[PDB]
């Protein structure tokens, strides 16, 4: 449905994952930061859409940016 | 006591077995109704609905319409009863074809495309009739007087 | 091994029964009164507890919740309707947050959000800036 | 607001009386009143409780546009 | 020892100006500095907010305690203020002498920049704003006569305005009370209860019977006011008061006696309106007061305190359930006790419903001596009272939420009520959203039928009084058993509660004052739009109280709070979801409902009631009678009512009414204003800041106090808040000036 | 697409009502559509303009036809 | 169990604007879009519940579960990977008297249960093992 995509501006600060409403979001090794933590997206077939882990980011620009896109009943959220 | 308990005794469905949901009076009442009924066949379900539903529509338009006061109101009125029950046969085919599709195989459940054609049919000859039943009862209205 | 609650007209739907549902199972060492997501007040059996709802959401909602009991065994599943059934979380048995070596990246672009393409640079291609 | 500086000025040309455009038009006062006000009376009666003329339909479609306007809202 | 004891702390907080000096020292946020815009702003929207500041009951309740205090502070300076325009800058004397010529003003303008203009020539040698709120006439029914005694009663409140603000000071600096005292409803009830208005009610009883009642029956007779004795007179010679009222010479012996009887003179039940001035019988008030002391001094006798005998609240509240409500009114008594927005919620709406009683109540019995032919004061009256009402009841809503969001607990309430309704939300909401449905179609249909109908040529087919008509049988008959009430299901009654039900035409000097008030179609299709607009407003506010915490949208509601601006663009769109957008939603609505019921007040007493009777039986209605015929088309009500009625404020420039027309005219701005605060968002707002601030900085200067937008939610705050002054003031200049015109 | 918005997958496979609004209202962006080349852009983009030259042609021949048929021209 | 099950559904990912089946799929296999309630003694949803004597409240009547057993295969079906990913870095680091990969995971799981196992450092694990 939507797409996240995480840049190499992250700092893994793990904010954005412990704000994931429906857990899409994880924390994976990697080297380009001094936390040795990088964010990833592997279950984006469960984002609402909520930008609460783009609100969460504390870099100057967000290094984790949502693009609403093709809506499922997943990401519409109906319970019904 | 307590008279609202879960619905099929499972805790997290979305609904409450109350008095009005579940009571012996609304059990008896829509287990035998044409739409629920056991044994009636598509067509039959149909004509007992339609026969119900024309015989109260002509009312309305009868005692209320444009020409309400004319000696040719019941008249009019019978046609525009007629006319709604058209338009709902057209809601009721097109609802058809959408949910059923083109082609059945079951048969014998209200639920199909075959059964649901059979169903709209007996709607429409149920409610015309009905509505015609009730020209000739509202011609002349009997005072019961002895 | 379902908790203790009365009912509620906030409960699950037909999709729950023709499309897709879910559920969060959990094991306490008391039984306390927890809230529900779908309105409404339950208790927690001591020992294994199960409970069905619609949305994923519903479920972690709950895990949060959880949390703050105390209780951190808490497994979501999601149930087809033919019967299928799909471990979702914790996905690897380490939550989310903590870093667990074996897991790859996935959706990462190697530059700074402002290094994207033009959008009219891939006109009538199909693709977006930022997936191109 | 240009519409109505048109329609108000022509009004009172032909009405024969340009003085009242002249002189009410520089307060907002002269313009809900000697215009909004004063020159609604034909269409807020096409239809009344004594009968209607052919302003009728001009008058119900005054107030469907009013209705629209505030649902839009 | 004793379950009742009282304590305090002292020396609680220290008093010193160090903390003025610090802004935004209640909030550990705000307490660190100014780094933008929306510090200023959020410094005063959380300034009240005590739990926030907090996480002590008791020191929050120690706040409220002293708060109040300062509310109370400012209504006796408000009082005393008028009291005092009443002795230094009024006609009251001259009115008093000539109640039905002068026209009561107690506000006079300086001389400054043809502002003079706004000093009419009301009357009694006296130029001046004609005022409406109703004060001369209180005074004439409490025996005033003269301003000396207006001047002392204003001291009087002055005095009593810096005790309180000392008390405030006192109890909160000096005496704090600790939790447990707070904690004592029994107590406070029995005292309310019985002190509060019971001895309240005696006194004042007290006063009518000695004071009032005497006076007022020599002003009526026609005594000078100068000629009347002054009221110590009366309280001394006993032989005075036995002239007027022959039952005093047998004094208190009656009443210690079981002969209550004696006392018929000046304890009566006349019922109706006294026909020289068209206000109640003062004798009957004197009664009522007498009869409701009783009543309420010995319900205050109901609790227990601290002598065994009496009730518990927890007990009787715990006893009441039943088989379809599980533990029933448990748990009840723990939130109504530890939790302020609760008790807020159940008293806000309680006083806004009074006062929308008092509105209706105050019109079909005027209470006051020559109030019911100023129609002026009359529609003053009956609208503010009817908007304060408005309010608070949206209010009572609001806090029920901000409860439910903030001190609901699911543990206290298992299987109660209020878990129960929390269980069958979806039930409550759904069916009242169909019953809104329907009456909004049918009732507004019913509207726009007719005016279909009328322009097509065909108004025999429109739903009239002469046409298919829909009378309203039910309230037709009610009235009529109140016309015959007296007399027979109330024996000793001498006449109607009111003329409304039925009756003969009250007047008082050549206009109507009271006459009985027929329902007929048009009554009916209004009262059902009512209920359409009441209705509605309760599922806004309902859906709010009732999903404040979750929905199957956001599952989480709760812990995003009682004010969040949304959830995310997510999830097809989540703005304005909050318990506190449809409190906003709900405002527009009551706003809506309350300006339908003021218009169907001054439309229908203008056109049936008011209006001027000859000496023979000849009755001028001020609009002729047009709300039978045109009030049933929508037309109807732009052309015989708002076009016709607003002649007067678009025609007042150049009179001592111009301000109204010039506040008709602002009013209309200010909501308009208000529409691109309620229709834009944040995003462009700040966008455009951006490129102001280049400006600043090109020129070497900029705030260090960044400059920003203001939030979602005070976008919407500051939308709805000019929406419902413009609103309110545009109909408020409307009825003024019309009514000036009328009386 | 199998669906409404034959013009767009993501409208089509939505589950909602949204498929049948979004669908209408972005039918005349023909440079969004799934699978558009320039060359066929430009050629319905000129095609399309002939049909609205044929509406407002029709739209004068109905004044003057009824007009003529139910006026007072003479 | 198939673990394709949600992935081998009819979502057809568009190019562009959609994230795609991401890790367990999209959208459900089943089609929401069914019928609705029928007459007593009658079906609508293919493997429908019978309504018995109350067909119209037929969808109030669940059919779809989980078994406690089954749970606990989906659990180790689906963490199959990591556990293998676990035991492999465990074996590399020179295990003390190793024997097979297979083996190692049994005796590390009999103790410490299967999730501890899973949510263990080589490092505690080697720890652990070193009996
Ligand atoms: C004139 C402007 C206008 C109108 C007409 C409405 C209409 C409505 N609002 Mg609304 N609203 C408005 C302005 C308006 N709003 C504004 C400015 C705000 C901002 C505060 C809101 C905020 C608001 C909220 C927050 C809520 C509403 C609700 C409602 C509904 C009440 C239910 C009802 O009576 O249905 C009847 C609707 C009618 C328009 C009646 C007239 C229609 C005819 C006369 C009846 C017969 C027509 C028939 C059905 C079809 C005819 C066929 C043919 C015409 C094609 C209704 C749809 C409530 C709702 O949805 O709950 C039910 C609700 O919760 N409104
Ligand atoms: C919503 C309010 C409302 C109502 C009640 C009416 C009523 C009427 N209109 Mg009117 N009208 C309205 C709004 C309304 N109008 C509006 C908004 C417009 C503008 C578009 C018009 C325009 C209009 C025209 C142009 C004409 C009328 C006409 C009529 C009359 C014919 C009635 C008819 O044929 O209905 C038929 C009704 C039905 C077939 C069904 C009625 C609903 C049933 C009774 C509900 C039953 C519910 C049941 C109790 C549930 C429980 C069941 C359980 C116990 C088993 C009637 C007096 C005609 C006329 O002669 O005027 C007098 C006419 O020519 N109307
Ligand atoms: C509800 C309370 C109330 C209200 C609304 C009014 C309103 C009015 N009174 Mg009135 N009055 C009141 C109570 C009230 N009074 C009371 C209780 C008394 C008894 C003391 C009086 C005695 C009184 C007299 C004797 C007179 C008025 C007059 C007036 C009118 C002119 C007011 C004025 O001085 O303007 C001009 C305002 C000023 C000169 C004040 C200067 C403005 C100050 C400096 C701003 C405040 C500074 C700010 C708070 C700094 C904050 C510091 C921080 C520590 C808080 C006005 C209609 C006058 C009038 O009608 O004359 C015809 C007049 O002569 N009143
Ligand atoms: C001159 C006497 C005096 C002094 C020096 C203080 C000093 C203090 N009080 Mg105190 N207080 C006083 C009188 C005084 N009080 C009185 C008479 C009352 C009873 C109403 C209170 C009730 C009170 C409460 C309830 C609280 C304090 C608090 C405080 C402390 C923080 C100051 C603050 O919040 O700024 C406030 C500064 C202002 C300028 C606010 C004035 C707002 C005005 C009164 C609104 C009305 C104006 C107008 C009429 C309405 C609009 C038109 C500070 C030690 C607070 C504290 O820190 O407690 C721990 C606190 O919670 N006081
Ligand atoms: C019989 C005793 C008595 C009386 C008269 C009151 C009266 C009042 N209480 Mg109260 N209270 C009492 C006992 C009493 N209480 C007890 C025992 C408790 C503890 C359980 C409380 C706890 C309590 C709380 C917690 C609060 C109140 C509040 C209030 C006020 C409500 C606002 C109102 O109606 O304004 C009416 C206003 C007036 C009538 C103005 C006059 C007020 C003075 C104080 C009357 C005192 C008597 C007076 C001097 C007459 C003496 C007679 C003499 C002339 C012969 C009101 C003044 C609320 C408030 O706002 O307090 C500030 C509030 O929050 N009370
Ligand atoms: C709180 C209200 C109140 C107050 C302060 C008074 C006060 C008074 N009344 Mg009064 N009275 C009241 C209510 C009140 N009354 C009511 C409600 C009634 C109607 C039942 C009366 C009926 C009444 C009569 C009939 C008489 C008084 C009299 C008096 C005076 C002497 C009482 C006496 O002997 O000492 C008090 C003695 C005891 C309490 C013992 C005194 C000024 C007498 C008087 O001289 O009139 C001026 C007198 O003859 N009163
Ligand atoms: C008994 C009355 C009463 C009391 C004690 C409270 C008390 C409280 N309310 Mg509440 N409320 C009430 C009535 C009351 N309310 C009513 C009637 C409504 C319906 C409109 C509301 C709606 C409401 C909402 C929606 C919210 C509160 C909140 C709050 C809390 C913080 C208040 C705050 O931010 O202070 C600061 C106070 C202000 C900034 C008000 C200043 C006045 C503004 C600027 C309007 C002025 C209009 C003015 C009269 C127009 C003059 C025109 C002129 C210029 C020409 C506090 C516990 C808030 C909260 O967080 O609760 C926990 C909150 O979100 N209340
Ligand atoms: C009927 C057979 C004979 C009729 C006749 O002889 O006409 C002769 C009469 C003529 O009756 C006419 O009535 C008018 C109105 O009052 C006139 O005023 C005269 O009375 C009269 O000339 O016809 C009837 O009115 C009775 C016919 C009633 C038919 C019953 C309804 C049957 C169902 C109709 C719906 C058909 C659509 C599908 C059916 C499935
Ligand atoms: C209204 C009739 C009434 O008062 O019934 C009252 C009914 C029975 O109440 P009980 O006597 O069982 O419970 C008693 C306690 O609630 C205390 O009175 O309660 C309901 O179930 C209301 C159902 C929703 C209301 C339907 C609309
Ligand atoms: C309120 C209520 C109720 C109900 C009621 C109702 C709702 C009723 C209805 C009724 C109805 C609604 C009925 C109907 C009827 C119908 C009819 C009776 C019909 C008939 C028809 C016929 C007979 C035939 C026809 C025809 C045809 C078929 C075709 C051909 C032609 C002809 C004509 C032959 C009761 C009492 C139960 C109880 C209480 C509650
Ligand atoms: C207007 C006003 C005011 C007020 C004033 C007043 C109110 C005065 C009066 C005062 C008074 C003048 C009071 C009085 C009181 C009295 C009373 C309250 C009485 C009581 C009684 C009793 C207590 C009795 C008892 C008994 C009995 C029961 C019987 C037997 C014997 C005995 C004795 C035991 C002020 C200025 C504040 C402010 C402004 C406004």
Same mark, same amino acid.
């Given at each position: 449905?939507?797409?996240?995509?995480?840049?190499?501006?992250?700092?893994?600060?793990?904010?954005?994952?412990?704000?994931?409403?429906?857990?899409?979001?994880?924390?994976?090794?990697?080297?380009?930061?001094?936390?040795?933590?990088?964010?990833?997206?592997?279950?984006?077939?469960?984002?609402?859409?909520?930008?609460?882990?783009?609100?969460?980011?504390?870099?100057?620009?967000?290094?984790?940016?949502?693009?609403?896109?093709?809506?499922?009943?997943?990401?519409?959220?109906?319970?019904? | 006591?307590?008279?609202?308990?879960?619905?099929?005794?499972?805790?997290?469905?979305?609904?409450?077995?109350?008095?009005?949901?579940?009571?012996? =009076?609304?059990?008896? =009442?829509?287990?035998?109704?044409?739409?629920?009924?056991?044994?009636?066949?598509?067509?039959?379900?149909?004509?007992?609905?339609?026969?119900?539903?024309?015989?109260?529509?002509?009312?309305?338009?009868?005692?209320?319409?444009?020409?309400?006061?004319?000696?040719?109101?019941?008249?009019?009125?019978? =046609?525009?009863?007629?006319?709604?029950?058209?338009?709902?046969?057209?809601? =009721?085919?097109?609802?058809?074809?959408?949910?059923?599709?083109?082609?059945?195989?079951?048969?014998?459940?209200?639920?199909?495309?075959?059964?649901?054609?059979?169903?709209?049919?007996?709607?429409?000859?149920?409610?015309?009739?009905?509505?015609?039943?009730?020209?000739?009862?509202?011609?002349?209205?009997?005072?019961?007087?002895? | 091994?379902?908790?203790?609650?009365?009912?509620?007209?906030?409960?699950?739907?037909?999709?729950?029964?023709?499309?897709?549902?879910?559920?969060?199972?959990?094991?306490?060492?008391?039984?306390?009164?927890?809230?529900?997501?779908?309105?409404?007040?339950?208790?927690?059996?001591?020992?294994?507890?199960?409970?069905?709802?619609?949305?994923?959401?519903?479920?972690?909602?709950?895990?949060?919740?959880?949390?703050?009991?105390?209780?951190?065994?808490?497994?979501?599943?999601?149930?087809?309707?033919?019967?299928?059934?799909?471990?979702?979380?914790?996905?690897?048995?380490?939550?989310?947050?903590?870093?667990?070596?074996?897991?790859?990246?996935?959706?990462?672009?190697?530059?700074?959000?402002?290094?994207?393409?033009?959008?009219?640079?891939?006109?009538?291609?199909?693709?977006?800036?930022?997936?191109? | 607001?240009?519409?109505?500086?048109?329609?108000?000025?022509?009004?009172?040309?032909?009405?024969?009386?340009?003085?009242?455009?002249?002189? %009410? %038009?520089?307060?907002?006062?002269?313009?809900?009143?000697?215009?909004?006000?004063?020159?609604? %009376?034909?269409?807020?009666?096409?239809?009344?409780?004594?009968?209607?003329?052919?302003?009728?339909?001009? %008058?119900?479609?005054?107030?469907?546009?009013?209705?629209?306007?505030?649902?839009?809202? | 020892?004793?379950?009742?004891?009282?304590?305090?702390?002292?020396?609680?907080?220290?008093?010193?100006?160090?903390?003025?000096?610090?802004?935004?020292?209640?909030?550990?946020?705000?307490?660190?500095?100014?780094?933008?815009?929306?510090?200023?702003?959020?410094?005063?929207?959380?300034?009240?907010?005590?739990?926030?500041?907090?996480?002590?009951?008791?020191?929050?309740?120690?706040?409220?305690?002293?708060?109040?205090?300062?509310?109370?502070?400012?209504?006796?300076?408000?009082?005393?203020?008028?009291?005092?325009?009443?002795?230094?800058?009024?006609?009251?004397?001259?009115?008093?002498?000539?109640?039905?010529?002068?026209?009561?003003?107690?506000?006079?303008?300086?001389?400054?920049?043809?502002?003079?203009?706004?000093?009419?020539?009301?009357?009694?040698?006296?130029?001046?704003?004609?005022?409406?709120?109703?004060?001369?006439?209180?005074?004439?029914?409490?025996?005033?006569?003269?301003?000396?005694?207006?001047?002392?009663?204003?001291?009087?409140?002055?005095?009593?305005?810096?005790?309180?603000?000392?008390?405030?000071?006192?109890?909160?600096?000096?005496?704090?009370?600790?939790?447990?005292?707070?904690?004592?409803?029994?107590?406070?009830?029995?005292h309310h209860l019985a002190g509060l208005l019971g001895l309240g009610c005696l006194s004042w009883s007290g006063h009518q019977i000695h004071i009032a009642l005497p006076i007022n029956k020599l002003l009526d007779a026609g005594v000078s006011p100068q000629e009347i004795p002054?009221?110590?007179?009366?309280?001394?010679?006993?032989?005075?008061?036995?002239?007027?009222?022959?039952?005093?010479?047998?004094?208190?012996?009656?009443?210690?006696?079981?002969?209550?009887?004696?006392?018929?003179?000046?304890?009566?039940?006349?019922?109706?309106?006294?026909?020289?001035?068209?206000?109640?019988?003062?004798?009957?008030?004197?009664?009522?007061?007498?009869?409701?002391?009783?009543?309420?001094?010995?319900?205050?006798?109901?609790?227990?305190?601290?002598?065994?005998?009496?009730?518990?609240?927890?007990?009787?509240?715990?006893?009441?359930?039943?088989?379809?409500?599980?533990?029933?009114?448990?748990?009840?008594?723990?939130?109504?006790?530890?939790?302020?927005?609760?008790?807020?919620?159940?008293?806000?709406?309680?006083?806004?419903?009074?006062?929308?009683?008092?509105?209706?109540?105050?019109?079909?019995?005027?209470?006051?001596?020559?109030?019911?032919?100023?129609?002026?004061?009359?529609?003053?009256?009956?609208?503010?009272?009817?908007?304060?009402?408005?309010?608070?009841?949206?209010?009572?809503?609001?806090?029920?939420?901000?409860?439910?969001?903030?001190?609901?607990?699911?543990?206290?309430?298992?299987?109660?009520?209020?878990?129960?309704?929390?269980?069958?939300?979806?039930?409550?909401?759904?069916?009242?959203?169909?019953?809104?449905?329907?009456?909004?179609?049918?009732?507004?249909?019913?509207?726009?039928?007719?005016?279909?109908?009328?322009?097509?040529?065909?108004?025999?087919?429109?739903?009239?009084?002469?046409?298919?008509?829909?009378?309203?049988?039910?309230?037709?008959?009610?009235?009529?058993?109140?016309?015959?009430?007296?007399?027979?299901?109330?024996?000793?009654?001498?006449?109607?509660?009111?003329?409304?039900?039925?009756?003969?035409?009250?007047?008082?000097?050549?206009?109507?004052?009271?006459?009985?008030?027929?329902?007929?179609?048009?009554?009916?299709?209004?009262?059902?739009?009512?209920?359409?607009?009441?209705?509605?407003?309760?599922?806004?506010?309902?859906?709010?109280?009732?999903?404040?915490?979750?929905?199957?949208?956001?599952?989480?509601?709760?812990?995003?709070?009682?004010?969040?601006?949304?959830?995310?663009?997510?999830?097809?769109?989540?703005?304005?979801?909050?318990?506190?957008?449809?409190?906003?939603?709900?405002?527009?609505?009551?706003?809506?409902?309350?300006?339908?019921?003021?218009?169907?007040?001054?439309?229908?007493?203008?056109?049936?009631?008011?209006?001027?009777?000859?000496?023979?039986?000849?009755?001028?209605?001020?609009?002729?009678?047009?709300?039978?015929?045109?009030?049933?088309?929508?037309?109807?009500?732009?052309?015989?009512?708002?076009?016709?009625?607003?002649?007067?404020?678009?025609?007042?420039?150049?009179?001592?009414?111009?301000?109204?027309?010039?506040?008709?005219?602002?009013?209309?701005?200010?909501?308009?204003?208000?529409?691109?605060?309620?229709?834009?968002?944040?995003?462009?707002?700040?966008?455009?800041?951006?490129?102001?601030?280049?400006?600043?900085?090109?020129?070497?200067?900029?705030?260090?106090?960044?400059?920003?937008?203001?939030?979602?939610?005070?976008?919407?705050?500051?939308?709805?808040?000019?929406?419902?002054?413009?609103?309110?003031?545009?109909?408020?200049?409307?009825?003024?000036?019309?009514?000036?015109?009328?009386? | 697409?199998?669906?409404?918005?034959?013009?767009?997958?993501?409208?089509?496979?939505?589950?909602?009502?949204?498929?049948?609004?979004?669908?209408?209202?972005?039918?005349?962006?023909?440079?969004?559509?799934?699978?558009?080349?320039?060359?066929?852009?430009?050629?319905?983009?000129?095609?399309?303009?002939?049909?609205?030259?044929?509406?407002?042609?029709?739209?004068?021949?109905?004044?003057?036809?009824?007009?003529?048929?139910?006026?007072?021209?003479? | 169990?198939?673990?394709?099950?949600?992935?081998?559904?009819?979502?057809?990912?568009?190019?562009?604007?959609?994230?795609?089946?991401?890790?367990?799929?999209?959208?459900?296999?089943?089609?929401?879009?069914?019928?609705?309630?029928?007459?007593?003694?009658?079906?609508?949803?293919?493997?429908?519940?019978?309504?018995?004597?109350?067909?119209?409240?037929?969808?109030?009547?669940?059919?779809?579960?989980?078994?406690?057993?089954?749970?606990?295969?989906?659990?180790?079906?689906?963490?199959?990977?990591?556990?293998?990913?676990?035991?492999?870095?465990?074996?590399?680091?020179?295990?003390?008297?190793?024997?097979?990969?297979?083996?190692?995971?049994?005796?590390?799981?009999?103790?410490?249960?299967?999730?501890?196992?899973?949510?263990?450092?080589?490092?505690?694990?080697?720890?652990?093992?070193?009996?």
């Amino acid at each position: 449905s939507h797409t996240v995509k995480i840049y190499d501006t992250c700092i893994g600060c793990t904010q954005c994952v412990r704000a994931c409403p429906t857990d899409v979001l994880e924390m994976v090794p990697w080297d380009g930061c001094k936390s040795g933590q990088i964010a990833s997206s592997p279950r984006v077939e469960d984002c609402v859409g909520c930008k609460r882990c783009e609100t969460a980011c504390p870099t100057d620009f967000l290094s984790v940016r949502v693009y609403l896109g093709a809506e499922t009943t997943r990401s519409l959220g109906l319970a019904y | 006591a307590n008279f609202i308990k879960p619905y099929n005794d499972d805790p997290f469905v979305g609904h409450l077995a109350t008095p009005i949901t579940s009571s012996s =009076l609304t059990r008896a =009442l829509l287990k035998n109704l044409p739409a629920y009924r056991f044994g009636l066949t598509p067509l039959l379900r149909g004509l007992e609905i339609g026969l119900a539903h024309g015989y109260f529509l002509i009312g309305p338009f009868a005692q209320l319409g444009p020409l309400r006061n004319s000696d040719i109101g019941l008249l009019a009125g019978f =046609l525009s009863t007629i006319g709604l029950i058209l338009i709902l046969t057209l809601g =009721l085919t097109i609802y058809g074809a959408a949910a059923f599709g083109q082609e059945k195989s079951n048969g014998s459940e209200l639920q199909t495309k075959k059964s649901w054609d059979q169903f709209k049919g007996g709607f429409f000859v149920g409610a015309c009739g009905s509505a015609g039943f009730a020209f000739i009862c509202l011609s002349s209205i009997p005072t019961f007087a002895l | 091994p379902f908790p203790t609650f009365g009912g509620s007209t906030g409960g699950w739907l037909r999709a729950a029964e023709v499309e897709e549902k879910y559920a969060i199972t959990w094991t306490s060492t008391k039984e306390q009164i927890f809230e529900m997501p779908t309105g409404g007040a339950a208790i927690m059996r001591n020992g294994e507890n199960l409970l069905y709802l619609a949305r994923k959401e519903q479920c972690l909602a709950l895990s949060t919740q959880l949390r703050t009991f105390k209780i951190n065994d808490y497994k979501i599943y999601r149930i087809f309707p033919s019967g299928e059934v799909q471990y979702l979380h914790p996905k690897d048995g380490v939550f989310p947050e903590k870093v667990n070596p074996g897991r790859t990246s996935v959706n990462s672009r190697g530059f700074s959000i402002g290094k994207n393409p033009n959008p009219a640079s891939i006109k009538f291609s199909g693709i977006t800036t930022y997936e191109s | 607001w240009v519409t109505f500086y048109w329609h108000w000025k022509h009004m009172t040309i032909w009405g024969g009386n340009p003085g009242q455009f002249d002189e %009410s %038009s520089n307060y907002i006062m002269g313009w809900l009143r000697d215009y909004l006000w004063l020159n609604s %009376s034909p269409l807020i009666n096409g239809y009344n409780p004594f009968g209607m003329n052919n302003l009728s339909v001009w %008058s119900w479609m005054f107030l469907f546009g009013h209705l629209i306007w505030a649902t839009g809202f | 020892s004793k379950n009742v004891q009282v304590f305090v702390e002292k020396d609680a907080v220290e008093t010193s100006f160090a903390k003025w000096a610090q802004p935004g020292h209640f909030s550990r946020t705000l307490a660190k500095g100014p780094k933008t815009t929306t510090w200023i702003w959020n410094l005063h929207a959380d300034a009240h907010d005590f739990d926030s500041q907090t996480s002590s009951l008791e020191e929050v309740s120690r706040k409220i305690f002293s708060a109040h205090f300062g509310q109370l502070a400012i209504i006796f300076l408000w009082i005393s203020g008028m009291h005092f325009h009443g002795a230094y800058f009024s006609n009251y004397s001259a009115w008093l002498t000539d109640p039905i010529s002068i026209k009561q003003s107690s506000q006079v303008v300086w001389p400054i920049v043809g502002q003079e203009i706004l000093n009419a020539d009301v009357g009694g040698n006296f130029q001046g704003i004609q005022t409406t709120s109703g004060w001369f006439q209180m005074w004439r029914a409490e025996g005033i006569t003269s301003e000396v005694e207006l001047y002392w009663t204003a001291i009087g409140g002055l005095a009593m305005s810096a005790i309180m603000l000392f008390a405030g000071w006192f109890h909160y600096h000096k005496a704090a009370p600790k939790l447990e005292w707070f904690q004592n409803a029994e107590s406070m009830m029995n005292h309310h209860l019985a002190g509060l208005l019971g001895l309240g009610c005696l006194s004042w009883s007290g006063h009518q019977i000695h004071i009032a009642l005497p006076i007022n029956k020599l002003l009526d007779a026609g005594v000078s006011p100068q000629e009347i004795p002054l009221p110590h007179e009366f309280l001394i010679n006993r032989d005075l008061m036995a002239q007027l009222y022959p039952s005093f010479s047998k004094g208190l012996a009656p009443f210690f006696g079981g002969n209550w009887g004696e006392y018929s003179d000046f304890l009566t039940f006349k019922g109706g309106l006294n026909p020289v001035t068209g206000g109640l019988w003062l004798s009957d008030i004197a009664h009522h007061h007498l009869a409701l002391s009783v009543l309420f001094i010995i319900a205050g006798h109901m609790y227990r305190t601290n002598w065994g005998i009496g009730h518990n609240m927890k007990e009787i509240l715990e006893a009441h359930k039943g088989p379809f409500t599980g533990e029933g009114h448990k748990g009840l008594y723990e939130i109504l006790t530890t939790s302020w927005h609760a008790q807020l919620a159940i008293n806000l709406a309680m006083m806004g419903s009074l006062s929308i009683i008092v509105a209706h109540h105050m019109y079909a019995m005027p209470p006051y001596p020559y109030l019911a032919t100023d129609y002026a004061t009359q529609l003053s009256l009956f609208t503010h009272h009817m908007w304060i009402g408005g309010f608070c009841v949206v209010g009572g809503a609001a806090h029920g939420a901000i409860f439910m969001v903030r001190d609901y607990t699911p543990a206290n309430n298992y299987n109660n009520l209020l878990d129960r309704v929390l269980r069958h939300r979806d039930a409550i909401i759904s069916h009242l959203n169909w019953v809104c449905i329907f009456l909004g179609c049918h009732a507004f249909g019913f509207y726009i039928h007719n005016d279909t109908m009328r322009a097509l040529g065909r108004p025999q087919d429109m739903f009239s009084d002469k046409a298919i008509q829909l009378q309203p049988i039910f309230a037709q008959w009610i009235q009529n058993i109140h016309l015959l009430a007296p007399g027979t299901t109330a024996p000793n009654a001498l006449a109607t509660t009111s003329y409304a039900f039925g009756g003969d035409v009250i007047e008082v000097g050549g206009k109507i004052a009271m006459m009985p008030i027929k329902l007929g179609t048009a009554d009916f299709m209004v009262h059902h739009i009512h209920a359409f607009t009441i209705h509605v407003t309760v599922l806004i506010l309902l859906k709010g109280v009732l999903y404040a915490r979750s929905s199957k949208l956001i599952p989480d509601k709760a812990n995003l709070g009682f004010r969040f601006p949304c959830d995310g663009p997510g999830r097809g769109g989540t703005c304005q979801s909050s318990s506190w957008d449809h409190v906003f939603l709900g405002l527009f609505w009551m706003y809506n409902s309350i300006s339908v019921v003021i218009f169907h007040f001054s439309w229908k007493m203008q056109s049936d009631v008011w209006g001027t009777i000859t000496p023979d039986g000849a009755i001028s209605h001020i609009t002729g009678g047009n709300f039978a015929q045109s009030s049933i088309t929508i037309n109807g009500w732009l052309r015989d009512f708002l076009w016709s009625q607003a002649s007067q404020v678009i025609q007042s420039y150049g009179s001592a009414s111009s301000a109204y027309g010039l506040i008709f005219l602002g009013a209309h701005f200010i909501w308009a204003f208000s529409l691109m605060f309620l229709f834009s968002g944040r995003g462009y707002w700040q966008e455009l800041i951006e490129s102001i601030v280049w400006a600043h900085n090109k020129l070497n200067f900029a705030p260090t106090i960044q400059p920003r937008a203001l939030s979602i939610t005070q976008g919407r705050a500051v939308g709805l808040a000019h929406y419902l002054l413009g609103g309110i003031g545009t109909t408020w200049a409307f009825f003024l000036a019309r009514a000036i015109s009328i009386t | 697409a199998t669906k409404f918005p034959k013009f767009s997958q993501a409208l089509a496979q939505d589950p909602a009502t949204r498929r049948i609004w979004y669908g209408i209202a972005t039918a005349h962006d023909l440079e969004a559509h799934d699978g558009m080349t320039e060359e066929n852009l430009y050629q319905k983009i000129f095609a399309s303009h002939f049909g609205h030259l044929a509406i407002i042609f029709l739209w004068t021949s109905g004044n003057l036809f009824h007009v003529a048929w139910q006026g007072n021209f003479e | 169990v198939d673990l394709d099950y949600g992935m081998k559904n009819s979502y057809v990912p568009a190019t562009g604007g959609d994230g795609g089946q991401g890790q367990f799929g999209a959208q459900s296999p089943n089609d929401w879009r069914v019928a609705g309630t029928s007459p007593v003694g009658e079906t609508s949803y293919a493997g429908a519940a019978d309504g018995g004597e109350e067909p119209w409240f037929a969808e109030a009547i669940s059919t779809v579960s989980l078994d406690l057993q089954k749970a606990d295969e989906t659990l180790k079906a689906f963490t199959k990977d990591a556990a293998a990913f676990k035991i492999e870095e465990f074996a590399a680091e020179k295990p003390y008297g190793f024997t097979s990969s297979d083996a190692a995971m049994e005796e590390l799981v009999g103790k410490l249960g299967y999730s501890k196992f899973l949510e263990m450092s080589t490092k505690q694990l080697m720890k652990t093992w070193g009996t």
